[PDB]
Design a protein around this ligand. Structure first.
Ligand SMILES: [Zn+2]
Length: 109
């Protein structure tokens, strides 16, 4: 498995095992491009205690990276609430326009 989940900075992010090794107190850069530090006191190093919500940008980015059809990624995207900052970041990660992410994610408003 090239990609694994890892809770850090209050969300379950995904990371590329070819580029990072997870260690307590050490930063890594997740698929969403956020640099995050797992901490033992937050339960980050104990998988049975991962209670944070999933990182929406990492989730969508993982599906895209596993080669999902755009319709399926869209259904997946619809189960998150997308702030404008989340749309912008996903746009940067998918390397597409803001308008295409709005369409993909069903973000209204
Ligand atoms: Zn993330």
């Amino acid at each position: 498995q090239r990609y694994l989940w890892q809770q850090a900075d209050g969300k379950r992010h995904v990371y590329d095992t070819a580029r990072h090794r997870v260690q307590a107190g050490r930063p890594f850069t997740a698929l969403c491009g956020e640099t995050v530090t797992p901490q033992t006191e937050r339960g980050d190093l104990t998988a049975g205690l991962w209670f944070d919500g999933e990182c929406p940008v990492c989730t969508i980015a993982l599906a895209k990276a596993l080669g999902w059809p755009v319709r399926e990624i869209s259904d997946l995207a619809h189960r998150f609430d997308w702030s404008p900052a989340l749309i912008t970041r996903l746009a940067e990660v998918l390397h597409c326009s803001f308008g295409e992410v709005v369409e993909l994610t069903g973000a209204r408003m």
